[PDB]
From a paper:
Clathrin-Mediated Endocytosis (CME) enables cells to dynamically regulate the composition of the plasma membrane and mediate uptake of transmembrane cargo, such as ligand-bound receptors. This process is orchestrated by the clathrin Adaptor Protein two complex (AP2), which interacts with much of the endocytic machinery and functions during the earliest stages of CME. NECAP is a coat-associated protein that binds to the alpha appendage and beta linker regions of AP2 to facilitate endocytic accessory protein recruitment to sites of endocytosis. NECAP is a ~ 29 kDa, soluble protein composed of three domains: an N-terminal Pleckstrin Homology with ear-like function (NECAPPHear), a central Extended region of conservation (NECAPEx), and a C-terminal domain with low conservation (NECAPTail). Here, we determined cryo-EM structures of NECAP-AP2 complexes which show that NECAP clamps AP2 complexes into the closed, inactive conformation.
To understand whether NECAP binds to the site of phosphorylation or a conformation induced by phosphorylation, we determined a ~ 3.2 Å cryo-EM structure of the phosphorylated AP2 core bound to full-length NECAP2 (mouse). We observe density for the entire AP2 core, with additional density contacting the mu subunit. The remaining unassigned density at this interface extends from the amino terminus of residue 159 of mu, and can be attributed to the phosphorylated mu linker (amino acids 154–158). Our structure is of sufficient quality to build a near-complete molecular model for the phosphoAP2-NECAP complex, which shows that residues in NECAPPHear interact directly with the phosphorylated mu T156 (pT156). These data show that the phosphorylated complex can exist in a closed conformation and suggest that the mechanism of NECAP binding to open complexes that are not phosphorylated must be fundamentally different. We also noticed that NECAP R112 forms electrostatic interactions with the T156 phosphorylation mark and may be required for binding. Indeed, NECAP R89 lies only 5 Å from mu pT156, suggesting that it may also contribute to coordination of the phosphorylation mark. Additionally, NECAPPHear does not block cargo- or PIP2-binding sites and no obvious steric clashes would prevent AP2 from transitioning between open and closed states when bound to NECAPPHear. One feature that might prevent NECAPPHear binding to the open conformation is that mu T156 is packed against the beta subunit of AP2 in this structure. Nonetheless, while NECAPPHear is required to inactivate AP2, binding of NECAPPHear alone does not explain inactivation.
Author numbering:
A (entry chain B): 5 to 151, 156 to 191, 196 to 268, 275 to 548, 553 to 581
B (entry chain S): 1 to 141
C (entry chain M): 2 to 140, 154 to 222, 241 to 255, 260 to 374, 379 to 435
D (entry chain A): 11 to 44, 50 to 238, 244 to 589
E (entry chain N): 7 to 23, 29 to 96, 102 to 138
Write the structure that this text describes.
């Protein structure tokens, strides 16, 4: 009410030379209107004065008006409809850059009334003789569809597939594919042959669009599906990674001696995606993580490509590490453990903790290398690093559960590492190893007494494992540890206020006071010994190799 | 007490900044950019009272500009909202339906108005009649 | 592709263009809250929040976001976002907000001719000269090392890093963070034979009344987000920084203080450790101020211990350890001797084993040109020591 | 006219680097000129405008001080404006500036003294306090001083007291400052009240005679054509007079105290009246006096009749149109409810606050609504407040949800009437928002169920329907298993709550929950073996399944294997 | 063959003559182009390509990294003496971080070659 004048000011001074007669400094004016409203200045009062500059013959000045109009076409569409009479005069002008830019500007306006204006002037643009205009009109059908005469436009998209300029063919296929999400049949004789010949000549973004459409096609005969694949095979040599991953998605679908030759031609293009820029390697390695599950015989020999390089980002280091495990076999476990030992000495504390856990995943997967993984972790603990030692205790615990009564010489070396333990899960791993095997540990009660003095202010995982261990120590060594169990069950049932802790204290208190012989088969019995997408979801995500369903490893229903 | 007075548009660039507190030149730039990080976010139904780093900021927008006064936490925030509006009305008759560009071209006259009305972190003169009596007398001197 | 967003260094929208109205104006700030200002979230080039996917590529400052709602080819959008910025770099030189602000008109002419309803068109810079009318607005020998002596040898090469930083905070009793900044330094201890040249790498939480500031040691040469240097032998301050954005706050004090008349006072204070439970804060001391006319108080504590100190006029409450994602409470009952009480802030001391600015070390590659050792022969240690400075909550 | 050319020459730059070259070609031009005084002040306005854009200026100070010694007004006020903005610490310049100010202060031109008094009050360094702080009270005292100079001198002495209190000692001039409250020019009184207020913060008893002068002037102001501001008689002076009275206790003279009552009664009585204008600037100026009136009544805490009328006036602002009055009424009632006198009258507004909490959108006003509910809680209304907060938490946003859960659990234990209500309260709290409930809150709920027998049929019942929801919190599952495992027999008589249904209700949530949550549900599965022998076949296959025996956790395995051997042996 | 490292903006200095760096010209780069260290088998090839077409300006088989094929200059950490195949050629780099990746990728190759020899000695 105070700083709105319309007699003087910046809006007044802008409105002045926009009304002037020189063309070249009305062009400077509209640039000042775009640069005002980009930063966030309110130039809504200049709207009927900018569209007076539409009636001209200059191409540069007419685009600057259209750029001003496009910024209104999405946020406040009810204002940009007020100049729609100037659009429909421009969409039959010569200099067909004006005709295409008129049709784009009309299509981007979300107003129900504009469908009366994307009538009959649109169908001339679908039949235009400049292919740059047919390219524009092909997309604007999908703009109009996203808002029965347009059902007559749908067959005009099919007519544009038979064109000599292939970029017109490209956007028409991309238009039909988005329309077919909410409704195209690609029957062989003329559709597939004209798509694959346009595939060899169109631009790099249209080859994505054609190879995304062929994945919807269902072939019938086995050598008919083979006859497609000799044309798709040279498309996995392209510079773009989006073209290669779309070519793979067709070839992973149309996979019914040429079978053996095709799987040998999938491995060099998937290797060469990893020389790319780090966002692309993430998109590739999330798909490589799916391909080595469904077809593990493609990249069986290529584990050296997947070794983590130091300057990779953290989202490429963690995805390269999941594929090194899936290719970890007995023929190459020795160089994997050369790498996993090396990554565990890096300064990235987030990545070292996963490299040490990847060692125990190689011991569980490759059973023949269990001793080499145990000797690898022992060399890590001798470094005395705080975040490696207490990580490797967790991993050794899962080996003792997996391979019991084999590796228990090393506990005399693990038990001297107690003062380097401050994680709750890492302390609970040593208490389990002291709780088990206590007829092998010399001073198991002197170790477990050192934890009961600080029984509170420990985690309930540590409190429960220390409860389970001292009961196991009692049934293994009665009459030495009578003081510990009367200590810890007084700590559990009387001092602690956790209900889950104090009744587990009771269940042990009831069993020891009923029959310690009966408690031996209950507590100290032998425990039964103890990571891949299930093939319903897995075979779904191979049908979406390029897309975000494979980057997320989730079906498209959750998007 | 008042600690500064800001005038800045939605573009972010200031039209007046008078400081009543001893800050460094880069600290003055640091506060300015994080005032309109507060003021531009708030809508027309939020309150005009934002706590700001240990004191409070008081604003009102005049359709292209923000007048921000930054006072202590104890201060009467409903009286400093009207001393803002009292300061605009003095600028309204002194510049004859003031625009934004009167603050750009005549910044040295704006410091005369602020000294006339807000001196040493307090409100000096509230009367619109006596300020316009004083400012036009200095205009012809 | 629903809309290309180009954000500045600080997280503000420089220039943007939406192509699909499935994208709202909620999505321009959905990226700001949950990608740029992610406090503890580990970075990913594609993230998904609330049925909307976020593609971003950084070019040295600038967040180039790409927003979509469909199951689009993700390798398509990233290969687009490289050729979206190679078109711009061929017109601007580099990509920065000083070049983008000079070129709001050229980007708008590009963001229509390159991308059309989310469908990438021909991005060839030779073909664009027929379509783009506007023009871009353009804008030896180190001899001897002075700081490191020659012929150093050690029995075993080792290397120690300490990221040492201190949190400062003023927070309202409602939970609004009023002011926060972290002051830190990377102290490196180099026990390395020979004269190694080594490369250091970190994440992007450092900008290379507190103001965001970073100085280096004179050994460091800056020219990616990597740093090459030749470390002096021994104790050595590698980097020295302050930061103010996206501060990780380890604790929260919730001061529920009720005045009963003018003769009695009860104070409830709740501590919530706001970090992951595998970590463990230590040396925790919450001093709670009392009025000047306090007779004697009655304090009960859940864990830890507290004692009233009339010489300080404050209740000092000390906890030995606190695991993350937990909660403690103290209660107090003050009797007074009958103006109003001006409230000092509840100050707090602690020490956490993580770096509260978000700084992390990604790699540290040590290379000696003329000896028989390399990086995997070098034992490296990393330790994060978070600490409080002025960490206070209004009562 | 040369300035407006240069500014629009900067504004017509199309890049940042075009500015730097245009600035530097002008900085090189101005440096070459360093003249007519008109041509000298034009360049300083150029140099000042370059500074305010943020560019570094490292000259021009000696040219600006040469403007201070001029005799035309515009050359002086541009010279002082350069000095006030660009503060240099050259010891030669500070000597030259102080001599230029002593020339203007010794002058009897009121406009030349007005520039000098502002330049001291804008820079305010110690070197200007060391030369001037003995002259400024002499100008304020003297009877020949113009009233507009009396305004600027009083506020200039205010900053010299704020910057360096030791260089402004009190004395003879203090008894004549308080006489300015009797002055006819209200602008002089306005600059006087700000001066007396800050000086009475540390030496209150010296300025004690201003208490009687403040009330008598305020009684005339409340009960001036140039000082009305939208039909309100002198709002900012009446705000400053009410802040002056807050530096003191209620006065010694009961004739002063009685006069202080009806002026505060008049302010309250005007608030009840219909407004004399529709514009919001009338009501903001009208209420600016009112909230400082209420802050004075709270400060004294001496007339309970005024406190009751003040609380009744603040209840009118809770259901008000604008957000600015709803927020300030909630801050005031939090400070008002703590008093001995108004605390019973705030409690009558319990219906008004909750109806404001449910409908307010603004998150700042919404959380001061919660603080008022916590502040006015008592034994008499705790069941009402807690039940209304729980009715808010079912539809609340996640922004305010954390602090309300903390306040429900604090009011529940503190004001627990019996032990049947508290158990019903927190179990209702864990069902609604269980992820914000601390475990020592959750631990004590079970200790009351175990210790006392009467609630056990009621607690084990209410947990069972709480578990029938598809979206239970994981703390609800943990309190769900332990109570049904201990007291499922107390509700086994219901065919809707049959023992096989209680097991299937828990085991439907045994997955999709955490690792210590699964370990607690195993503990009650064996309690269903002990209590419910007809369920025993349906539990043991769950225990002997591979998902519990070959479970990757140690503690989930050790607890599942022991319970399979308790059930068979 | 695999490609170990690709570096643009790499200078080639003809050497006028030990091995100090200020002795060379350091202002007249005798050749400029793109650097690629390729390797196949047990050796590594330092191939110099022009920026535009990619023709092989020079090539140096290495076969041991601290050996005689690549020798560091004593003044700086950027300049290298290359035995192309014969003759000796002086390289150049822009900063340390380009010379860092030159030196690490060579050593990371011959670390792998030492391990594959050691696996054959098992």
């Amino acid at each position: 009410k105070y700083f709105t004048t319309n007699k003087k000011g910046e809006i007044f001074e802008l409105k002045a030379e926009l009304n002037n007669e020189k063309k070249e400094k009305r062009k400077e004016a509209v640039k000042k209107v775009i640069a005002a409203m980009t930063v966030g200045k309110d130039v809504s009062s200049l709207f009927p004065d900018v569209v007076n500059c539409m009636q001209t013959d200059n191409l540069e000045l007419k685009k600057l008006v259209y750029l001003y109009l496009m910024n209104y076409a999405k946020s406040q569409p009810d204002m940009a409809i007020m100049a729609v009479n100037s659009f429909v005069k421009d969409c039959e002008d010569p200099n067909p850059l004006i005709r295409a830019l008129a049709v784009r500007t009309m299509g981007c306006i979300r107003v129900d009334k504009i469908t009366e204006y994307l009538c009959e002037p649109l169908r001339k643009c679908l039949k235009d003789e400049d292919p740059y205009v047919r390219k524009t009109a092909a997309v604007c059908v999908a703009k109009l569809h996203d808002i029965v005469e347009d059902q007559g436009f749908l067959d005009s998209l099919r007519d544009l597939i038979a064109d000599s300029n292939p970029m017109v063919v490209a956007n028409a296929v991309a238009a039909l594919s988005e329309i077919s999400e909410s409704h195209l049949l690609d029957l062989n004789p003329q559709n597939i042959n004209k798509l694959l010949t346009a595939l060899n000549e169109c631009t790099e973004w249209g080859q994505i669009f054609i190879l995304d459409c062929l994945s919807n096609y269902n072939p019938k005969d086995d050598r008919e599906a083979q006859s497609i694949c000799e044309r798709v095979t040279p498309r996995l040599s392209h510079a773009n990674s989006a073209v290669v991953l779309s070519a793979v998605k067709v070839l992973m679908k149309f996979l019914e001696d040429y079978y053996n030759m095709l799987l040998k031609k999938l491995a060099p293009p998937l290797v060469t995606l990893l020389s790319g820029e780090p966002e692309v390697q993430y998109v590739a390695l999330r798909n490589i993580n799916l391909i080595v599950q469904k077809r593990p015989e493609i990249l069986k020999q290529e584990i050296k490509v997947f070794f983590v390089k130091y300057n990779d980002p953290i989202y490429v280091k963690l995805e390269k590490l999941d594929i090194m495990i899936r290719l970890a076999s007995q023929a190459n476990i020795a160089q994997v453990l050369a790498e996993l030992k090396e990554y565990a000495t890096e300064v990235d504390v987030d990545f070292v903790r996963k490299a040490v856990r990847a060692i125990g995943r190689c011991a569980i997967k490759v059973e023949q290398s269990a001793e080499r993984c145990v000797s690898t972790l022992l060399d890590l603990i001798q470094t005395k690093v705080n975040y490696v030692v207490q990580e490797a205790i967790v991993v050794i615990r899962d080996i003792f559960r997996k391979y019991p009564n084999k590796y228990e010489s090393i506990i005399a070396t693990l038990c001297e590492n107690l003062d380097s333990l401050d994680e709750p899960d890492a302390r609970a791993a040593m208490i389990w190893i002291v709780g088990e095997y206590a007829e092998r540990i010399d001073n198991a009660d002197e170790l477990l007494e050192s934890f009961l003095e600080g029984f509170h202010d420990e985690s309930t995982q540590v409190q429960l494992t220390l409860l389970t261990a001292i009961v196991k120590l009692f049934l293994k060594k009665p009459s030495e540890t009578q003081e510990l169990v009367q200590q810890v069950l007084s700590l559990a049932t009387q001092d602690s206020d956790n209900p889950d802790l104090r009744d587990r204290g009771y269940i042990y208190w009831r069993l020891l006071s009923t029959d310690p012989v009966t408690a031996k088969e209950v507590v100290l019995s032998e425990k039964p010994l103890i990571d891949l997408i299930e093939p319903t979801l897995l075979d779904e995500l191979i049908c979406h190799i390029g897309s975000l369903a494979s980057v997320y490893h989730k079906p498209p229903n959750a998007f | 007490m008042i600690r500064f007075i800001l005038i800045q548009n939605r573009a972010g660039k200031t039209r007046l900044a008078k400081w009543y507190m001893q800050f460094d030149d880069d600290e003055k730039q640091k506060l300015i950019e994080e005032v309109h990080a507060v003021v531009t976010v708030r809508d027309a139904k939020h309150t005009n009272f934002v706590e700001f780093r240990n004191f409070k900021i008081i604003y009102r927008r005049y359709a292209g500009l923000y007048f921000c006064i930054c006072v202590d936490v104890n201060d009467n925030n409903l009286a400093y909202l009207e001393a803002i509006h009292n300061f605009v009305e003095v600028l309204n008759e002194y510049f004859h339906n003031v625009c934004e560009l009167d603050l750009v071209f005549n910044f040295y006259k704006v410091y005369t108005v602020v000294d006339e009305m807000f001196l040493a972190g307090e409100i000096r003169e509230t009367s619109q009649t006596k300020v316009l009596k004083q400012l036009l007398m200095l205009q012809s001197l | 592709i629903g809309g290309l967003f180009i954000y500045n260094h600080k997280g503000e929208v420089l220039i943007s263009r939406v192509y699909r109205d499935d994208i709202g104006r909620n999505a321009v700030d959905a990226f700001r809250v949950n990608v740029i200002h992610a406090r503890q979230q580990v970075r990913s080039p594609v993230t998904n929040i609330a049925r909307t996917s976020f593609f971003h590529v950084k070019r040295s400052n600038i967040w180039l976001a790409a927003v979509t709602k469909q199951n689009v080819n993700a390798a398509m959008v990233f290969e687009f976002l490289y050729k979206m910025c190679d078109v711009m770099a061929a017109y601007f030189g580099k990509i920065s907000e000083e070049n983008i602000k000079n070129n709001f008109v050229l980007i708008y002419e590009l963001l229509d001719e390159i991308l059309d309803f989310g469908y990438p068109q021909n991005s060839e810079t030779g073909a664009l000269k027929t379509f783009i009318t506007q023009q871009g607005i353009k804008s030896q020998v180190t001899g001897q090392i002075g700081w490191r002596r020659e012929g150093i040898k050690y029995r075993r090469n080792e290397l120690f890093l300490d990221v040492l930083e201190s949190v400062n905070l003023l927070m309202s009793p409602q939970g609004q963070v009023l002011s926060a900044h972290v002051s830190g330094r990377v102290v490196m201890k180099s026990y390395l034979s020979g004269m190694p040249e080594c490369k250091f790498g970190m994440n992007d939480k450092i900008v290379i009344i507190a103001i965001d500031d970073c100085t280096f040691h004179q050994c460091v040469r800056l020219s990616e987000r990597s740093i090459s240097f030749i470390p002096p032998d021994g104790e050595f301050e590698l980097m020295r920084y302050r930061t103010t954005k996206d501060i990780i706050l380890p604790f929260r004090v919730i001061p529920l203080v009720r005045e009963v008349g003018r003769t009695k006072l009860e104070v409830k204070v709740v501590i919530k450790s706001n970090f992951k439970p595998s970590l463990l804060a230590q040396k925790i001391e919450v001093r709670i101020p009392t009025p000047l006319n306090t007779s004697g108080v009655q304090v009960i504590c859940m864990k830890g211990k507290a004692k009233y100190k009339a010489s300080e006029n404050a209740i000092v409450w000390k906890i030995k350890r606190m695991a993350g994602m937990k909660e403690s409470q103290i209660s107090a009952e003050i009797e007074l001797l009958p103006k109003k009480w001006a409230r000092p802030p509840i100050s707090m001391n602690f020490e956490v084993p993580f770096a509260p600015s978000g700084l992390k070390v990604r790699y540290l590659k040590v290379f000696e040109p003329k000896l028989n050792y390399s990086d995997h022969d070098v034992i490296k240690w990393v330790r994060y020591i978070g600490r409080s400075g002025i960490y206070e909550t209004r009562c | 006219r040369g300035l407006a050319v240069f500014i629009s020459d900067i504004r017509n730059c199309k890049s940042k680097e075009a500015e730097i070259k245009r600035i530097n070609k002008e900085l090189a031009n101005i440096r070459s000129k360093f003249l007519d005084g008109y041509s000298k002040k034009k360049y300083v306005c150029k140099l000042l405008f370059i500074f305010l854009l943020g560019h570094d200026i490292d000259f021009g100070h000696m040219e600006a001080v040469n403007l201070l010694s001029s005799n035309r007004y515009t050359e002086k006020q541009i010279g002082y404006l350069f000095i006030s903005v660009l503060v240099n610490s050259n010891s030669e310049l500070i000597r030259l500036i102080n001599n230029a100010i002593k020339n203007d202060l010794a002058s009897r031109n009121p406009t030349f003294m007005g520039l000098a008094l502002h330049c001291i009050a804008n820079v305010g360094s110690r070197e200007m306090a060391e030369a001037f702080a003995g002259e400024i009270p002499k100008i304020l005292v003297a009877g020949d001083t113009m009233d507009s100079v009396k305004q600027s001198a009083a506020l200039c002495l205010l900053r010299l007291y704020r910057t360096s209190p030791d260089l402004v000692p009190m004395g003879d001039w203090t008894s004549r400052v308080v006489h300015l409250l009797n002055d006819q020019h209200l602008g002089v009184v306005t600059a006087a009240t700000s001066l007396i207020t800050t000086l009475a913060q540390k030496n209150p008893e010296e300025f004690k005679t201003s208490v009687s002068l403040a009330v008598s002037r305020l009684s005339r102001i409340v009960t001036l054509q140039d000082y009305t501001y939208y039909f309100v008689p002198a709002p900012w002076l009446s705000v400053k007079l009410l802040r002056l009275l807050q530096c003191y206790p209620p006065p010694e003279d009961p004739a002063v105290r009685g006069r202080l009552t009806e002026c505060l009664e008049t302010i309250l009585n005007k608030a009840q009246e219909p407004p004399k204008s529709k514009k919001v600037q009338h009501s903001n100026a009208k209420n600016a006096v009112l909230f400082e009136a209420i802050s004075l009544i709270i400060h004294h805490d001496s007339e309970p009749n005024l406190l009751v009328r003040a609380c009744n006036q603040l209840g009118q602002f809770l259901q008000h149109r604008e957000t600015n009055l709803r927020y300030l009424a909630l801050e005031s009632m939090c400070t008002l409810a703590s008093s001995e006198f108004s605390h019973e009258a705030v409690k009558t507004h319990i219906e008004t606050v909750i109806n404001a909490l449910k409908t307010e959108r603004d998150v700042s006003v919404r959380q001061r609504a919660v603080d008022l509910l916590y502040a006015m809680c008592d034994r008499s209304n705790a069941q009402q407040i807690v039940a209304e907060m729980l009715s808010y938490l079912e539809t609340a946003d996640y922004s305010i949800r954390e602090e309300i859960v903390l306040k429900v659990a604090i009011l529940a234990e503190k004001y627990a009437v019996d032990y049947t209500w508290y158990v019903d309260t927190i179990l209702n709290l864990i069902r609604i928002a269980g992820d914000y409930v601390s475990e020592e809150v959750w631990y004590r709920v079970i200790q009351i169920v175990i210790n006392r027998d009467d609630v056990q049929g009621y607690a084990a019942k209410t947990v069972f329907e709480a578990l029938q929801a598809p979206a239970c919190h994981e703390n609800l599952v943990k309190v769900g298993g332990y109570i049904l495992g201990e007291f499922g027999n107390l509700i086994a008589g219901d065919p809707r709550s049959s023992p096989l249904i209680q097991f299937n209700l828990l085991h439907s949530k045994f997955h999709l929950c955490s690792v210590p949550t699964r370990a607690l549900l195993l503990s009650t599965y064996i309690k269903f073996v002990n209590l419910f022998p007809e369920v025993k076949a349906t539990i043991q296959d769950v225990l002997r399944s591979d998902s519990q025996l070959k479970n990757a956790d140690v503690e989930l395995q050790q607890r599942a294997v022991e319970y399979l051997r308790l059930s068979t042996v | 063959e695999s490609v170990l490292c690709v570096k643009p903006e790499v200078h080639v200095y003809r050497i006028p003559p030990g091995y100090r760096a200020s002795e060379w010209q350091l202002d007249q780069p005798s050749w400029s182009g793109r650097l690629r260290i390729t390797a196949k088998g047990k050796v590594a090839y330092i191939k110099l390509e022009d920026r535009t077409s990619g023709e092989l300006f020079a090539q140096a088989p290495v076969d041991q990294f601290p050996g005689t094929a690549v020798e560091s200059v004593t003044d700086s950490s950027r300049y290298f003496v290359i035995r192309i195949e014969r003759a000796f050629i002086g390289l150049g780099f822009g900063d340390r971080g380009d010379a860092f990746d030159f030196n690490v990728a060579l050593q990371d190759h011959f670390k792998w070659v030492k391990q594959q020899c050691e696996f054959a000695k098992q």
